[PDB]
Design a protein around this ligand. Sequence first.
Ligand SMILES: OC[C@H]1O[C@H](O[C@H]2[C@H](O)[C@@H](O)[C@@H](O[C@H]3[C@H](O)[C@@H](O)[C@@H](O[C@H]4[C@H](O)[C@@H](O)[C@@H](O[C@H]5[C@H](O)[C@@H](O)[C@@H](O)O[C@@H]5CO)O[C@@H]4CO)O[C@@H]3CO)O[C@@H]2CO)[C@H](O)[C@@H](O)[C@@H]1O
Ligand SMILES: OC[C@H]1O[C@H](O[C@H]2[C@H](O)[C@@H](O)[C@@H](O[C@H]3[C@H](O)[C@@H](O)[C@@H](O)O[C@@H]3CO)O[C@@H]2CO)[C@H](O)[C@@H](O)[C@@H]1O
Ligand SMILES: OC[C@H]1O[C@H](O[C@H]2[C@H](O)[C@@H](O)[C@@H](O[C@H]3[C@H](O)[C@@H](O)[C@@H](O)O[C@@H]3CO)O[C@@H]2CO)[C@H](O)[C@@H](O)[C@@H]1O
Ligand SMILES: [Ca+2]
Ligand SMILES: [Ca+2]
Ligand SMILES: [Cl-]
Ligand SMILES: [Cl-]
Ligand SMILES: [Cl-]
Ligand SMILES: [Cl-]
Ligand SMILES: [Cl-]
Ligand SMILES: [Cl-]
Ligand SMILES: [Cl-]
Ligand SMILES: [Cl-]
Length: 646
Amino acid sequence: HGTIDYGDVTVTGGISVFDAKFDELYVYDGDDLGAVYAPEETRFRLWAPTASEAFVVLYETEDGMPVKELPMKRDVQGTWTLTVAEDCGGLFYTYRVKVGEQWNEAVDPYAKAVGVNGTKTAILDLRSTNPEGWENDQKPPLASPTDAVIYELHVRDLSIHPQSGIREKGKFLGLTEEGTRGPNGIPTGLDHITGLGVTHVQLLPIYDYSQESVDESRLDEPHYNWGYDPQNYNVPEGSYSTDPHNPAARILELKRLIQKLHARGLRVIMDVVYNHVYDGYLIHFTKLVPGYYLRYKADRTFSDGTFCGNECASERPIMRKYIIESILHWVREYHIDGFRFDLMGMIDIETMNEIRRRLDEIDPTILTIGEGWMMETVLPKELRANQDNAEKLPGIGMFNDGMRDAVKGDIFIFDRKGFISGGDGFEDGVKRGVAGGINYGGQLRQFAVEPVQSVNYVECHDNHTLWDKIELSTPGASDEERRAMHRLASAIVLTSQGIPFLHAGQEFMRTKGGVENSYKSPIEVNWLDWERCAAHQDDVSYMRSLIALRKAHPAFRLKTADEIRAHLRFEAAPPHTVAFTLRDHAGGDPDRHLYVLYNANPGALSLELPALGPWEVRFGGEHVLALEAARLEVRGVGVVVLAVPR
Ligand SMILES: OC[C@H]1O[C@H](O[C@H]2[C@H](O)[C@@H](O)[C@@H](O[C@H]3[C@H](O)[C@@H](O)[C@@H](O[C@H]4[C@H](O)[C@@H](O)[C@@H](O[C@H]5[C@H](O)[C@@H](O)[C@@H](O)O[C@@H]5CO)O[C@@H]4CO)O[C@@H]3CO)O[C@@H]2CO)[C@H](O)[C@@H](O)[C@@H]1O
Ligand SMILES: OC[C@H]1O[C@H](O[C@H]2[C@H](O)[C@@H](O)[C@@H](O[C@H]3[C@H](O)[C@@H](O)[C@@H](O)O[C@@H]3CO)O[C@@H]2CO)[C@H](O)[C@@H](O)[C@@H]1O
Ligand SMILES: OC[C@H]1O[C@H](O[C@H]2[C@H](O)[C@@H](O)[C@@H](O[C@H]3[C@H](O)[C@@H](O)[C@@H](O)O[C@@H]3CO)O[C@@H]2CO)[C@H](O)[C@@H](O)[C@@H]1O
Ligand SMILES: [Ca+2]
Ligand SMILES: [Ca+2]
Ligand SMILES: [Cl-]
Ligand SMILES: [Cl-]
Ligand SMILES: [Cl-]
Ligand SMILES: [Cl-]
Ligand SMILES: [Cl-]
Ligand SMILES: [Cl-]
Ligand SMILES: [Cl-]
Ligand SMILES: [Cl-]
């Protein structure tokens, strides 16, 4: 790691990078940070207020020697500028700065293209990376965040299994391949995903993550990482391209993926990690403006509330500007439809609200959700964009961990049961999630003001899969009993108010063999196992039918808390069950009333129904012995949905 020199403070009039006054002096507001390319000329602008000198170093190859070093001119508000009056396309560059007594060299933080492993900025005309027809790219319609069904997927997981039937395994283009087949001829890849009826694919880190995680020059050797180690925020990851050495390839191929998903009726959500960088000492931010872009404690050490070594200082204006302009780059250049903010509680509220505001000016249907966990940091508590402050973050969804733990049990105490597995006293936790996490009434309240702020899930890339958690918490159960519990958990997600979220492979009871944190586990742990999918085609169809049920019934997708409080009623139900009605054509539902039973009791039950008319079975008939319209006879763990028709 070596030495960080925070600068000769005579350069900044005696004002240290750590002084609050620093943020009055050097707040550059221009829209031209980075390289602005033209065949006529390329203009460079670097923000580096503490540097006493700045150079652009030009390279001809991603690994070669400098062919030219050009001094930059000190400009306004801590920036440096340089105009090169030639066609610079095909060249590579870095910045070299003198900060204090030492010289540092770094990629452009505003890099839009890079060489292999992201060690040099690539000069490229981005118009030459657009797919044929990109100008006519249109998004599938979306009337409400509550109409989304999110499918969380890793680009490598999707296709790397040897029987995936996909040619470009591990690559962006692997998800553009249509008509791919797996074991016994089952659909795989894109056709499998569109066939489920999900609406959004949420992609694990597709920005450029560090060479320490996946070495893009050694892709012929085994490799795997989720990618939560950011290196270049504004350029795609090289290992998901067919040629990481061609700066244009990863850009064109990601746009091809997005174009194809849109044409097949899918939207794309990008997992973004603005809360930390791969290495606080080696990142370009620290080489160019040490002390500014990352958060420091009072003793001038890194704040490490991410447990990754560092936090980004989103609350400082130039970093706030950086994050916002990065998001807008992904929206405008790549047509991205949403963002999932990793450790959103490490980002400040003003930054999150300005992001939401800027996106609403472009397209309010663009999704913003995040991990709103309550986590310590030097960022003051009232500024953290987390669940405790959700009242201050309108329109931003947060993962509902209360609902998650109530349904499947404590994710950190592996053997602890929850609602689905026969634990005691989880019914109110499930009810709170059914109501969308809102202040429904009495003890049924969580953090959400509106149901658009609550993302419901029982599986994601983190922690055990739902199947693996059920296994660890039900040692006395058979796999057939656990499969019923698994199906019930998925049903709860898809019939609760709010935004439903599925982990890729949940539809076929994805297992990681009990691995809790698979971020760098081999592909054998992390792949979408298309053999298991072929053995679980009935479970896949069950998930497809659940998703179809939610789409057929807008009563499950109410947009406002007032509607939920006026139409959702919890009914009398015994322990280890939850029952509710959605009354009076809620949300424009075609049926007059719905009744939903979550039955975690494996035995036989006779239940009293509210006398609202001639109930009929709509879902889960396999659990129903009799319906008297009022009394319901059920047996076995699972969901039952009844309706009173119009
Ligand atoms: O269409 C009217 C239908 O609507 C509702 O059914 C829903 C189910 O309650 C729900 O479970 C889901 O059904 C899935 C099923 O869970 C999944 O396993 C798979 O089903 C397989 C069966 O495993 C298999 O035994 C066989 O099913 C037979 C069934 O035994 C027989 O009684 C009769 O109904 O014919 C069926 C086949 O046509 O094959 C199926 C298909 O592989 O896939 C199912 C569909 O995704 O979703 C249903 C709605 O789609 C009502 O609850 C039910 O009463 C009504 O009959
Ligand atoms: O690289 C240093 C860092 O690596 C490891 O941290 C990884 C976590 O173990 C891994 O689970 C993942 O954590 C992220 C979650 O997946 C994400 O959804 C959210 O909760 O934020 C987490 C951080 O962004 O990725 C990280 C980073 O690769 C290792 O465990 C750390 O101790 C180590 O400092
Ligand atoms: O040391 C880094 C850490 O990274 C990962 O931990 C993540 C959890 O796996 C993930 O569930 C989430 O934890 C939050 C809970 O879900 C929530 O209910 C509440 O308890 O807040 C938690 C965060 O404080 O996020 C963490 C942190 O990224 C990885 O899985 C760990 O193994 C690893 O230790
Ligand atoms: Ca990379
Ligand atoms: Ca909104
Ligand atoms: Cl759908
Ligand atoms: Cl690869
Ligand atoms: Cl907090
Ligand atoms: Cl328990
Ligand atoms: Cl809560
Ligand atoms: Cl058990
Ligand atoms: Cl019976
Ligand atoms: Cl009616």
